[PDB]
Amino acid sequence: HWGYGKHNGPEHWHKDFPIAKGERQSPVDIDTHTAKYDPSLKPLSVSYDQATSLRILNNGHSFQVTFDDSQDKAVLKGGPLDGTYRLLQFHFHWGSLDGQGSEHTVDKKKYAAELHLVHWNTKYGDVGKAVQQPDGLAVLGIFLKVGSAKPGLQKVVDVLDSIKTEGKSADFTNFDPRGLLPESLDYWTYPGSLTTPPLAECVTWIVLKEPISVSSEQVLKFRKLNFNGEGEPEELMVDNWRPAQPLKNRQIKASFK
Ligand SMILES: [N]S(=O)(=O)[C][C][C]C1234B567B89%10B5%11%12B85%13B98%14B%1061B821B326B%1174B%1252C%13%1416[C][C][C]S([N])(=O)=O
Numbered sequence: 001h002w003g004y005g006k007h008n009g010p011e012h013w014h015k016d017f018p019i020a021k022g023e024r025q026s027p028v029d030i031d032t033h034t035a036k037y038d039p040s041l042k043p044l045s046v047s048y049d050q051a052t053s054l055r056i057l058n059n060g061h062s063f064q065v066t067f068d069d070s071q072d073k074a075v076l077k078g079g080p081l082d083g084t085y086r087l088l089q090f091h092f093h094w095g096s097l098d099g100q101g102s103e104h105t106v107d108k109k110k111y112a113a114e115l116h117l118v119h120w121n122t123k124y125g126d127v128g129k130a131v132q133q134p135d136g137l138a139v140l141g142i143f144l145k146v147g148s149a150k151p152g153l154q155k156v157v158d159v160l161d162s163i164k165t166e167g168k169s170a171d172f173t174n175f176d177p178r179g180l181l182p183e184s185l186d187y188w189t190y191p192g193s194l195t196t197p198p199l200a201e202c203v204t205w206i207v208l209k210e211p212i213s214v215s216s217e218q219v220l221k222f223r224k225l226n227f228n229g230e231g232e233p234e235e236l237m238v239d240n241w242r243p244a245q246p247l248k249n250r251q252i253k254a255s256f257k
């Protein structure tokens with residue numbers, strides 16, 4: 001099984017998923033001086049007021065909070081997107097120490113973590129169909145730096161002890177993802193891929209410029225999770241990030257000057 005270790009990590013993934021060496025892989029380094037301001041880009045529309053969270057789950061690679069995506073309750077629109085994208089889940093990538101953890105980098109700077117809110121295009125009807133399409137998914141990426149606590153993250157942090165090991169899940173209703181967003185919705189965008197297997201080239205990436213701050217205590221709780229299942233040798237769930245991949249023939253566009 002793929003993972004993040006020496007023998008099964010990112011440098012091995014191409015053997016099971018040859019698209020790993022494809023033309024539009026993610027994440028990438030965002031070179032802020034080369035990204036082009038595009039005045040035609042619209043403001044991003046984030047409509048999360050009717051979001052219905054369902055469960056929180058340790059999937060052996062991250063933890064995720066899953067939403068009801070059977071109706072247009074929590075949707076992303078505008079920005080670079082055509083049409084309406086339903087929120088399915090959010091999850092994080094993080095490091096063993098604060099100087100790594102993000103997938104995207106900004107002028108080679110790594111953040112302590114990165115939040116991904118994963119959305120799929122309603123025109124394809126279900127996420128499995130959407131991953132087979134070049135405009136199937138839109139992932140909103142938000143950097144985390146360590147400093148002040150993020151109050152809207154605390155409800156997540158506090159239940160992580162109940163999903164320590166792979167396969168464990170818990171009820172996680174009434175969680176409002178608006179509490180994870182920075183002030184500004186200024187963003188960079190580019191065409192890319194899932195950053196985990198199957199590495200499908202189906203994502204419009206929207207990466208917010210403004211990080212959120214989380215406390216050291218909050219991120220420490222992420223690092224107490226385990227990659228392993230209960231009863232297996234304990235391996236801390238840390239460094240679950242894919243490094244930057246070649247930009248190749250792509251342009252990163254900025255929504256802001
Ligand atoms: N870091 S990331 O790119 O946001 C990966 C998120 C993980 C997934 B996204 B798509 B969305 B779909 B696949 B990918 B994996 B979980 B969430 B949901 C997924 C499982 C199904 C993919 S398949 N195997 O049906 O092609």
Ligand SMILES: [Zn+2]
Binds near residue numbers: 092093116
């Ligand atoms: Zn991710």
